[PDB]
Design a protein around this ligand. Structure first.
Ligand SMILES: Nc1ncnc2c1ncn2[C@@H]1O[C@H](COP(=O)(O)OP(=O)(O)OP(O)(O)=S)[C@@H](O)[C@H]1O
Ligand SMILES: Nc1ncnc2c1ncn2[C@@H]1O[C@H](COP(=O)(O)OP(=O)(O)OP(O)(O)=S)[C@@H](O)[C@H]1O
Ligand SMILES: Nc1ncnc2c1ncn2[C@@H]1O[C@H](COP(=O)(O)OP(=O)(O)OP(O)(O)=S)[C@@H](O)[C@H]1O
Ligand SMILES: [Mg+2]
Ligand SMILES: [Mg+2]
Ligand SMILES: [Mg+2]
Ligand SMILES: [Zn+2]
Ligand SMILES: [Zn+2]
Ligand SMILES: [Zn+2]
Lengths: 228, 48, 628, 547
């Protein structure tokens, strides 16, 4: 009787060893894991996790008595947390609020935020001021006619090689809450802008990826912007 | 490491690291299910 | 019974003879006497020492030599050769009792001792296994092609009964066939019993495909392959791609309804491995003292330069670049905000016949984590990260590519010029961010690619033209050319004496290699490079800043005056990184002045020789003080 | 008890693969064919030993005929049922078994039809007597094997149902019968395998001279003793071709080859000579390839556009849409320790050129397709024929500009024979006379110094030698390398392709081949001079426009 029965969620995860430490000519080995209740939907594919769990057995119907191992997850720890819109947190504690309010009344606030932008880079003070302004951005407006005015600022740095523009891009990628650093032709296997590809096991259209979309609400640092 | 998992770790708690390929869709498992006999109409509950 | 009574056989077959309890107990007693009393007439018991060593090392493997048993009891050696399975079970029990004679608490730790027979005399190739070798011990050589993962196979099988819930006793699982129980002995029922994995004990299992080594195959014949099953202790021993020699029992794999395609009652064959023998960057306490002894020599660095690629002659600056790339600098991250790369990228641009590929092969042999890749070739690891689904396994796997796979190591890219676009983008990201970002198949992540790159390229048109500068001789663009620290342009100009010595070297190499006919040793050198990479971490101090800043302006103003492509800050960083790499070969914790001068020499020579000849003539005379 | 096998041979007639008819099933026969696939040796259940399930006594020596059979006698009187048994694979007896696939010979295929294959099975001592790519004459029995794929075929497929006439039945109640299809394909079971030569007409020398009788070993000694033997060897190669003595010398040296050497580090030094023939249209460049395929053992012929990556190296193939994947030996392994003759190397696409220079680099073939990972032996000399870009050969352009073949392809060819057409009356008249004499006289117009069979015996004798460079040969070789590179330096861009070290290994290889041609154990400096002269004549000077 289904309208008087109670159910929980269960999820299959697939875990590989990290591709940095794999034998050169060998396939990276993987295990299936099962999680339930509040352990489901806690990690996205691609994240690096250490997981505590029971190493257990199932029989799948290659050897007279051969069993497939799996992991029953008891806990998941995320080593690094990816930056995205859904993963962004808007909650603040009162101590951080007080610290930011106390910071905002400093009369040399502009000077210290410009000095904090890439302290290892000699010169380019105007560029660092520009980078601070880019990090803040302007006010976005939505008007009664429906058309919107953007607040984001797009800055181009073009010049001779060896003038630390790539390091400025890297530091902006590090300091931004949401950021991606890509080339003009994209990444090694991550596209630029937006890619719509068919789903693997159900053959349905979905947004494959792309620098301009994963970095929504953030900064895309496009190195070698002329080749595109 | 993932390659040092042997048969001595079977049905034991192991801590192990890696990267995630895929997260499957959420399947619905049953915790409490009420059952009723087809013709006998005996009502029973199984808790899991 | 006696040995001479064991020589005579009464049963129909050998296996039925050994199956008898009296023959089994006689063989057990004789194996006990052999294990406890064998000496090599030198006053030492090698097997007692082996038992003590395996007990103190907490290992379940006992190596028993076949020639020792043959000299001691020849009939038991013949019995082992003919019927290895049950006699190995007997000698398992005998070796377990011999271990319990010394260590009485070893049974609770392991309860299983595997006997590994070594130096079996008969040698078989995989192409000559026949009908006579079934259920017999065979010693076969070959190359491992690929191996499966380690799976848990049931060893002590425990059941539970669905009628009463009682948990039954443990039963040994024979490796030949599945075991089943039909009685409960508590509720006296033949009901459905289920195996519970929490109280069942398992052994490790691996499946390894072995082919005949391609050197030994007859001409028109394909290399035969067999399949080898590795048990609990032998798992993950032999990596694929290496020549290994396996001793084991040759037997038939049983399958349901045989093969319908053949129409004949044909079985497949397996080898259950009894022993694995391989036909390491570990330094001992003496090895580090030897490293310190060889480092205190004044001319140590040059010896390392002379140790790079002995089969390659005359390319001293290329070998210096190889030594710098192999040792490498130190990466650093000041305050977490600003990162400076710490490994030397070397580009070998050369005409055909300058032996760049042999240098790449030498580095692949020498280095710790060396990954070989190429642009034009197909059967090699790719340079691009990917998410690939196996067509048969239907399993999605994340391949980091050769750049991620060479992390904390070296990636060697042969034929750097005719690369395609995706591989160029992968190299560009791997040298800029030292990482590779993937957004494929629902996987959005970044993989660390902190890898040094030693690339080889051919100039445009097949020759280097010294009249044109470097960028016009190579299809590589300016940003990818600027990322290399050492830029070795090698050209085969015609010099009579050089041609004579090179031809002499090559012809001598041929005449040494005929079948009818001060450098550091390679084994010491490889561990030396690993040690210096893993424990030194050199550092440069504050009072040398007045000379590098001086020579930086000295090259910059001359580059402005001459009008070549400019010297940037990255040449200074390349100087400071090559200095830290040269200081590692001395096992030195600090950077010296001669170290900096040698690094400045390397960088100046690498910058000058990539120029137009008009630029070369002025730059050689202006920078004569630093070239020395 | 030892199993015995009777092998019949010298049958009066040899049948084609397409002449196999159903009237000869269960009859002694002799067929011929070219072996394509060889399986590995597998055990076949000959004398099965069973144990009954409920009486549990062992019985042995059960006849096994093709399909798997279980005895129904059960001679112990303890139990009363017959069908249930269990096989004991340890106690039972097995024989060797191989399924080798053979294909119709190229001269036997009809006018428009494709070749059709046949699976012949070898048992016992006949196993592994056939190699991938050779012509074998199989004597055996035409047998018949169940085939399931004939279900969708048109026509009435025979079937078997159980006859129920003498069986008493009652309609008590509480009608099923066993019907099974009779669909089959013709197979062969051979007791004798002999390998006739793949030609139209063992490394140690002692086993070779033991094989020859007194008369032909005397003839071989007479050939060895002759002082003008090298000129006769050159003149005996490709008699239908007029002129082009340098190409004939190269072909002879390729058929001889150099020694294979392995250094202490582990790298391998190639003894195989790879030759590319480039030139103007209608210069008999394909006649050389025809002669090498029709003459040299272990030789295969391939066209450039009709090529493929899998067909030249190795193929991973699927049979009957099953889970099993097998390996087809490619053209490079069908010519292993022989010559792969590839006409129109220019028309070959880039992927196949990549897949073949990989097997020129490592002299091996790598397979990673599907679940099969394999390393394969393809040490093979390559005789390539290429046409220049634009059709005609431009004298003003270098060899690299005339050819679209890539630099890794070009770097491993020792000899580049550019054969050209020049219009003068004398040699055109003599060539025309030669061609019309060929058309008039067939074999009467061909008068070589040696016939094909004695040429092949001399080549196979000479390949046993392993020539060794002497003390003076070393210095004379390095002097020739010095003067050759000095000629490059003086010529500048006038040379077609510059001499590097690779030409020095090719010079050593050609010197070893010449020393083999004269049947000597040590390389004389005259052989060095001949190899250097041939290599110098390989490079032609680039014509330069006047300024
Ligand atoms: N003014 C500067 N102050 C501090 N460090 C600098 C300065 N200019 C260059 N560098 C350093 O020198 C290197 C220069 O690399 P980048 O200039 O960032 O490369 P880029 O030339 O800007 O980008 P390209 O044009 O694609 S090569 C980095 O390691 C910087 O840290
Ligand atoms: N300086 C040298 N010392 C020793 N052997 C050499 C030298 N130069 C060339 N060789 C030999 O010449 C051959 C050249 O082989 P490769 O290493 O493939 O040449 P390469 O420099 O890679 O040029 P490619 O193949 O056109 S990219 C090998 O047999 C080398 O051993
Ligand atoms: N120099 C020659 N000596 C003998 N026969 C020749 C010569 N040149 C041409 N022929 C004959 O003329 C015909 C030329 O055919 P092919 O050998 O196929 O031409 P080819 O040299 O291969 O040029 P392509 O590249 O195929 S257009 C054949 O019948 C040859 O026997
Ligand atoms: Mg940049
Ligand atoms: Mg090369
Ligand atoms: Mg032709
Ligand atoms: Zn009921
Ligand atoms: Zn029970
Ligand atoms: Zn019975």
């Amino acid at each position: 009787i289904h309208e008087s029965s109670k159910f929980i969620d269960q999820q299959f995860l697939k875990l590989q060893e990290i591709p940095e430490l794999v034998p050169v000519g060998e396939m990276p080995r993987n295990l299936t894991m099962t999680c339930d209740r509040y352990l489901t939907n806690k990690v996205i594919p691609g994240t690096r996790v250490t997981i505590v769990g029971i190493y257990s057995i199932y029989n799948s119907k290659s050897g007279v008595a051969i069993r497939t191992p799996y992991i029953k997850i008891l806990g998941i720890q995320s080593d690094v947390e990816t930056s995205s819109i859904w993963n962004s947190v808007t909650m603040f504690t009162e101590e951080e609020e007080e610290e930011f309010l106390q910071l905002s009344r400093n009369p040399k606030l502009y000077e210290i935020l410009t000095n904090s932008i890439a302290p290892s880079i000699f010169g380019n003070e105007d560029i660092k001021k520009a980078i601070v302004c880019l990090l803040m951005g302007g006010s976005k407006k939505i008007l009664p006619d429906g058309m919107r005015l953007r607040g984001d600022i797009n800055v181009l740095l073009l010049g001779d090689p060896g003038t630390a523009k790539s390091q400025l891009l890297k530091f902006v990628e590090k300091v931004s809450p949401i950021a991606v650093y890509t080339s003009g032709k994209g990444s090694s296997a991550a596209g630029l802008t937006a890619s719509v590809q068919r789903d693997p096991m159900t053959r349905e259209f979905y947004l494959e990826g792309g620098a301009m979309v994963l970095a929504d609400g953030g900064v895309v640092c496009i190195d070698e912007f002329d080749k595109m | 490491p993932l390659r040092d998992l042997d048969s001595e770790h079977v049905s034991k708690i192991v801590r192990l690291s890696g990267i995630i390929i895929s997260t499957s869709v959420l399947s619905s498992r049953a915790t409490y299910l009420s059952i009723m006999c087809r013709n006998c109409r005996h009502t029973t509950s199984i808790t899991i | 019974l006696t040995l001479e009574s064991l020589s005579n056989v009464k049963a129909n077959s050998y296996s039925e003879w050994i199956t008898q309890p009296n023959v089994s107990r006689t063989i057990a007693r004789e194996l006990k006497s052999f294990l406890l009393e064998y000496t090599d007439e030198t006053g030492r018991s090698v097997y007692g020492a082996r038992i003590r060593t395996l007990g103190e090392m907490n290992s379940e493997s006992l190596e028993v030599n076949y020639r020792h048993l043959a000299e001691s009891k020849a009939i038991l050696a013949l019995f082992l050769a003919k019927c290895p399975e049950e006699m190995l079970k007997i000698f398992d029990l005998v070796a377990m009792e011999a271990t319990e004679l010394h260590y009485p608490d070893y049974a609770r730790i392991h309860s299983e001792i595997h006997v590994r027979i070594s130096d079996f005399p008969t040698i078989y190739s995989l192409r000559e296994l026949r009908e006579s070798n079934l259920s017999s011990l065979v010693r076969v050589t070959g190359v491992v092609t690929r191996r499966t993962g380690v799976f848990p196979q049931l060893k002590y099988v425990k059941f539970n009964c669905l009628k009463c819930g009682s948990i039954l006793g443990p039963f040994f699982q024979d490796s030949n066939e599945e075991i089943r129980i039909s009685f409960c002995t508590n509720c006296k029922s033949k009901g459905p019993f289920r195996v519970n994995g929490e109280k069942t004990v398992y052994r490790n299992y691996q499946r390894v495909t072995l082919q005949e080594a391609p050197g030994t195959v007859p001409p028109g014949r394909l290399p035969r392959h067999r399949e080898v099953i590795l048990l609990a202790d032998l798992v993950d021993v032999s990596k694929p791609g290496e020549e290994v020699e396996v001793t084991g029992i040759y037997k038939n794999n049983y399958d349901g309804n045989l093969n319908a395609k053949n129409g004949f009652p044909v079985f497949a064959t397996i080898i259950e491995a009894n022993s694995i023998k391989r036909r390491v960057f570990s330094w001992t306490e003496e090895e580090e003292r030897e490293f310190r002894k060889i480092s205190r020599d004044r001319g140590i660095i040059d010896k390392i330069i002379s140790s790079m690629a002995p089969s390659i002659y005359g390319h001293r600056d290329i070998k210096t670049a190889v030594a710098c790339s192999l040792f490498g600098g130190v990466p650093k991250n000041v305050n977490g905000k600003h990162s400076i790369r710490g490994d030397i990228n070397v580009l070998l641009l050369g005409d055909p016949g300058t032996a760049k590929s042999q240098i790449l092969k030498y580095v692949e042999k020498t280095a710790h984590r060396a990954v070989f890749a190429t642009g034009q070739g197909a059967s090699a690891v790719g340079l691009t990260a990917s998410v690939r689904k196996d067509p048969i396994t239907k399993e999605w796997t994340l391949e980091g590519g050769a750049l991620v796979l060479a992390d904390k190591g070296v990636c060697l890219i042969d034929e750097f010029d005719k690369m395609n676009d995706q591989d160029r983008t992968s190299i560009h990201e791997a040298m800029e961010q030292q990482s590779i970002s993937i957004s494929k198949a629902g996987i959005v992540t970044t993989l660390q690619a902190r890898c040094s790159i030693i690339a080889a390229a051919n100039p445009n048109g097949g020759r280097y033209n010294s009249t044109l500068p470097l960028a016009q001789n190579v299809s590589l663009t300016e940003p990818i050319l600027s990322r290399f620290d050492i830029l070795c342009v090698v050209r085969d100009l015609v010099d009579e004496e050089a041609d004579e010595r090179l031809a002499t070297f090559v012809v001598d190499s041929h005449v040494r290699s005929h079948p009818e006919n001060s450098p550091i040793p390679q084994e010491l050198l490889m561990k030396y490079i690993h040690y210096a990479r893993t424990k030194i971490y050199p550092k440069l101090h504050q009072m040398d800043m007045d000379k590098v800043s001086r020579v930086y302006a000295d090259l910059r103003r001359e580059s402005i005056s001459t009008g070549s492509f400019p010297i940037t800050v990255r040449h200074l960083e390349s100087i400071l990184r090559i200095a830290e790499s040269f200081a590692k070969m001395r096992l030195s914790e600090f950077v010296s002045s001669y170290d900096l001068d040698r690094a400045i020499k390397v960088v100046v020579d690498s910058f000058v020789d990539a120029q137009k000849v008009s630029v070369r003539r002025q730059l050689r005379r202006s920078f004569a003080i630093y070239t020395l | 008890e030892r199993v015995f096998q009777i092998s019949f041979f010298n049958l009066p007639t040899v049948h084609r693969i397409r002449d196999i008819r159903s009237e000869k099933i269960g009859s002694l026969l002799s067929i011929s064919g070219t072996v394509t696939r060889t399986s590995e040796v597998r055990p076949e259940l000959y004398k099965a030993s069973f144990t009954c399930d409920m009486c549990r006594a062992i019985v042995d020596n059960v006849e096994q005929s093709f399909k798997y059979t279980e005895p129904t006698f059960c001679p112990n009187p303890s139990c009363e049922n017959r069908a249930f048994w269990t096989l004991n694979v340890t106690r039972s007896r097995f024989l060797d078994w191989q399924k080798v696939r053979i294909q119709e010979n190229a001269n036997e295929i009809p006018t428009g039809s494709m070749p059709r294959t046949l699976d012949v099975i070898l048992r016992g001592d006949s196993v592994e007597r056939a190699k991938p790519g050779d012509r074998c004459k199989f004597t055996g029995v035409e047998i018949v094997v169940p085939d399931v794929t004939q279900l969708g075929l048109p026509g009435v497929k025979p079937s078997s149902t159980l006859d129920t006439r003498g069986i008493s039945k009652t309609t008590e109640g509480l009608r099923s019968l066993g019907v099974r299809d009779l669909t089959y394909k013709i197979s062969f079971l051979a007791c004798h395998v002999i390998s006739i030569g793949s030609n139209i007409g063992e490394r140690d020398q002692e086993v070779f001279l033991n094989s020859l009788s007194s008369d032909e070993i005397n003839e071989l000694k007479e050939m060895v003793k002759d002082e003008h033997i090298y000129d006769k060897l050159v003149r005996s190669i490709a008699p239908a071709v007029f002129g082009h003595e340098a190409v004939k010398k190269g072909i002879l040296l390729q058929m001889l080859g150099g020694v294979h050497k392995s250094t202490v580090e582990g790298i391998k030094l190639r003894g195989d000579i790879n030759i590319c023939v480039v030139g103007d249209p209608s210069t008999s460049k394909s006649q050389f390839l025809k002669y090498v395929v029709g003459f040299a053992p272990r030789s295969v012929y391939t066209s450039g556009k009709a090529s493929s990556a899998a067909g030249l190296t190795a193929a991973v193939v699927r049979d009957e849409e099953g889970g099993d994947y097998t390996i087809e030996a490619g053209a490079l392994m069908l010519a292993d320790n022989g010559i792969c003759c590839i006409d129109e190397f220019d028309k070959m696409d880039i992927s196949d050129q990549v897949a073949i220079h990989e097997a020129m680099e490592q002299q091996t073939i790598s397979i990673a397709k599907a679940g099969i990972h394999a390393t394969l032996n393809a040490r093979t000399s390559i005789l390539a024929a290429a046409n220049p870009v634009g059709g005609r050969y431009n004298r003003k352009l270098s060899l690299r500009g005339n050819l679209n073949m890539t630099a890794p392809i070009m770097s491993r060819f020792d000899l580049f024979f550019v054969i050209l057409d020049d219009c003068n009356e004398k040699i055109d008249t003599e060539l025309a006379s030669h061609i019309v004499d060929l058309h008039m006289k067939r074999d009467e117009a061909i008068e070589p110094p040696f016939s094909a069979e004695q040429l092949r015996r001399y080549i196979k004798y000479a390949r046993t030698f392993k020539p060794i460079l002497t003390k003076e040969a070393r210095s004379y070789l390095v002097e020739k390398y010095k003067e050759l590179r000095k000629d490059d330096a003086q010529g500048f861009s006038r040379s077609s392709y510059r001499i590097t070290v690779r030409q020095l290994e090719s010079m050593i290889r050609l010197s070893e081949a010449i020393a083999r041609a004269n049947c000597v154990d040590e390389i004389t400096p005259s052989f060095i001079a001949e190899a250097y002269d041939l290599l110098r004549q390989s490079i032609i000077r680039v014509d330069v426009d006047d300024v």
